[PDB]
C-alpha cells in the first residue's frame, strides 16, 4: 500500500508504480485515460473528455499505441525498430503518462510535456527514448507525454463537415494539455509553469499550439526540435485535404460528406492504413498524406501568415536542428541511397533526387536548387552529390523553416534560443555517412546515457547531463543558461546578431547565421520563382 | 640619304615600304633600339573614314622613325584634372584621324638570331587608348629579356567601330582590321628587325584582351600569330560585342544626333562631320545608365566574326593554341566612381543598400527585375546586410564578376575543354605608387606597369621587392612567348605554374610572395553568372 503511488485526479483514483532510475526511485503513472476512446462513431471526430471512474484505476503500465503504419523497410534493424510501436495497436489509444520524483515533489514543480514525432502518421509516447524517469530523477522534473491519433484517424478531414472537421490529433494533444491544467497539481506539478517540447511532427505540433488561441492558455513555453508549423510538409489546404480524403474513400470502396464518412467509419483500421500512402500527389520523401489542415478554426490562417502577423511578446522559445536533417529520408525512396552502401550517386541521380525531394518545384526552381548545391570543384564526385542531396532535403524541410520561424518570432517579441546538435551517438547503428540524423538528439535530452547498461561513453553521459539541465533550465525560467552557474553563455537568437550555439562534447560555441545564405536562397529567392 | 655615312649604322632598317631610321634609347641596363611611328596603313581620313584600312604605299627616302606618332581620335578624360590615376591613361600625343602607326622595340644592337615577338594591343573600352603611353614602354622587355616588342595604334570610337552592317562604306570592325593589318606587317617585316615571324605572341589588357580573343576567333587572323595572352578581358561577355541590328540602331541614332538623316547617304554625311563632333556625341547614344558599357564596339558581322564569340568558343577547336589568361583582384572598383551614385575617389564610397540595388540595376542593365534581385540576394552579406563597406565591396564585385572575372572563367573553361593549353592567374599586388584610393584595391589595368617592367627604372620610386616582382612577371610572360609555358624550363627551385584544366581548375596568385596554386576561379559565383542567370531570360 504505497501512498505516494496513490493519486486522486478529477475523474477518480489512480495507482502508479515505483520505477528504478540509476540515481534512485521515481513515481510513474502510465496509461491514464484523458479521453473517451475514439472508436466507432467517434472515429475522425474531436476527442471527448474521459468520464470519471470508480475504484482505483491501475496506472502502472503503458497503454496501446494509436493505430498506424508499421515500418518494415529493415526488419529487426535497431535504427528503425527503435521508432516502431512497442505496445499493441488500437484506436482505443488516448492515454497519457506522468513521471514525477519519488517521493512526490515538496513544492510545485515545472512541467515538461512531450509530444512525439513520426510525420503525423506514426509515433508513440511509450517508446524507450521518451522515458521520463531520468529527467524526473536527476532534475526533479514532472514530465507528461500523451498519445495522439495519427494518420487518417488523426487527420483525415472533409473541411466544413462535423463528422470529420480535421486536426483531431491536435485536439487530442490539446485535451491532454487541459488535463494537465486540471490535474497535474495532484502529482506535485505546477500548472502555471508548463513547457511543451517535441521533435519533428511533434515540434510542428508544438508550433501549432503556439499559433492556436485556445491552446495558448494551456502552456507558457515551447521547444521545437527539428520541426516547425510552417514549411512544406506540416500542413495542407482545406481543398487538398478534401481531395485526399475523397481519394482514400474511393480506394476503400466509399461511397454527401455524411455518407462518405459513415462508410469510412465502417472500414477496419488496417484497410485505411493499407491505402493511406496511395493518395499523395507526387513522388516524395519527407511528405505525408494526412497532416494538420488549415481549417480556419484550429488554424485561423496558414502558419506562415500567422507567424508573419502574430504578436509573440510573452513567449519564450527554444529551437534547433541536428547536423544532418536530410540523411534519414534519403534511404526512404531516393534511387541510389541505402543504409548498407555508402550511397554514392551520379549527377543524373542527383538531378532526379532533387525532383523527388522538391516536388512542387518548377523546372526552373529545381535547376536553381541543383546549381546552388553543386560544388563546382567537384560537380561529379559521388560523395559530394550524396551529401548535397542530403543537405537539399534537410535544409528545405527543417533547417530553413526553422531559421524563418526563429527570425519571425524574435522579430515579433519572443525570447528565442537556437541550437545546432552535432554529436553522433557512439551507439548509433545507422551508417556513418548519415552523420547526426534526424531524431538522434532525443536520447541525450531524455538522459538515456545516464543508464550504465546502455553502453554510452562517459563523455556522452556528462553531455547528456548538460542537455538535461539546459532543457530543464529553460522549462524553469525560459532561459537555458544556469541561473547561478564555467561555460560560455547561451545568447538569445535575434534578427540582428543571429546567434546560436553548437551542442556537442566540447563546451558551448556561439555561432552566427543559421545557414544564412542557403536559407536566404530557400526563403527569399526561390518563392519569387513562382 | 646624303648623310647615311655619318649616322649610326645600327639604326637603319629597310621594310617593304622603304627605309627607316630609329633611335637608340637608354634603358636601366643598357641601350635598346626603338623604331617609332612606322606607318602600316594609308591615313584613314576623308573618304576613308569608317572604311577598312589600306596598306601603306611605299615611300621614298629615309623615314624618321624616332618619335611616337599621333594618337587615334578619341574622348579625353577630364574628371580629375592633374590626377595621375586618370592622366596616365590619357593621350600623350596629339589627336588625329591620321594615326595608323606602329612601334618596334628591339635590343641594341638588333638580335643575332630570330627572336620571339610580342605584340601589344592596348585597351580603353574600344573608345580610347594609344600605343605610345608610358605604361606600354617596350624598352625594359627588350633590354632585359631580349624581346622584340611591337605595338600598334588602332582606330577607336566611331572611327573604329561605327557600323552599318551590310553596307560597304561602313562594314564595321575596322579597328580590328587595323590591328590585323599591323599583324600582317609584322609577318612580312619583323625579320628585318631580328624578329621571328614564326613565333608571334599577342598580348593585351581590357578591350585589348577582347581584341586578342577576337583574333583567336577569326580565321584570317589565325595565320598571323601562334600564342595569346588575355589580361582582364575576353571576346565573350556583355561589353565586347554588339549584334548587327543594335550596331545599325546606334549608328543611325548618332547620325541623327549630329544632324545626319540609304546607308551611303548617311555615311557620307557622317564623313562630312568634324572628328570632335563625333566624339562629342558618341556617349549620347547608348540605351541606359551604364558603367563598363560602350557605344561602338566590335560587331557580330558574320564576316570578321562569323558568329557570336560565345558560339565560336563553344564550337571551336583550339588544340594547337596556348593561352595565358587572368584578372586583377578588383576588376570592378575603377568603374564604380564613373557613374554609380555614392562612389568617389575622394570619400570612402560607403553606400546604403538602396544605393546597392540601384547600382546593380546600372551595372547589369540588361537584367530583368528578377535577375537583378537574384544578383542582389547572391551578393548580400546576411549577417550584416546593411553594412556600407560590405555593400560597397559587393557592388564592386558584381561589376567586376559580371564584366571580367566570369567571362574569363568561362573562356578558360571552354578553351581547356576544347584542346588549348591554358594558364590562369589572379594578380593581387597593389602598386606602391598607386594614387587611387586604397578601397579600390588592385584596380583594372594596374598589372600592366609590372608586366612591362617599369619598376626597373629607379626614377619611378617603386620598392625593391616590386622590381624583383616585375622581373619575375617579365620572365613569366616572355617564357610563355618563347615556349607556350610561363615556367622556367631549368628552374628546379621555384614553384611550378600548372596549366588550367576543367578537372583541377588550377590557377596562380601573382604577388610579392612566391607562386601559390589555387583551385576554382570564383567557381560558385561564376556558375551563378554563367549557368543560372542566363536561364532567367
From Swiss-Prot, chain B:
GO cellular component: basement membrane; cell surface; extracellular space; Golgi apparatus; neuromuscular junction; perinuclear region of cytoplasm; plasma membrane; side of membrane
Entry-linked InterPro entries: AB_hydrolase_fold (IPR029058), AChE-related_enzymes (IPR050654), AChE_tetra (IPR014788), CarbesteraseB (IPR002018), Carboxylesterase_B_AS (IPR019826), Carboxylesterase_B_CS (IPR019819), Cholinesterase (IPR000997)
Top enzyme class: hydrolase
Disulfide bonds: 72-99, 260-269, 406-526
Tissue specificity as recorded in UniProt: Predominates in most expressing tissues except erythrocytes where a glycophospholipid-attached form of ACHE predominates.
Keywords for this protein: Cell membrane, Disulfide bond, Glycoprotein, GPI-anchor, Hydrolase, Lipoprotein, Membrane, Neurotransmitter degradation, Secreted, Serine esterase, Signal, Synapse
Listed GO biological process terms: acetylcholine catabolic process; acetylcholine receptor signaling pathway; cell adhesion; osteoblast development; positive regulation of cold-induced thermogenesis; receptor internalization; regulation of receptor recycling; retina development in camera-type eye
Function: Terminates signal transduction at the neuromuscular junction by rapid hydrolysis of the acetylcholine released into the synaptic cleft.
UniProt name for this protein: Acetylcholinesterase
Species: Mus musculus
Gene that this polypeptide is encoded by: Ache
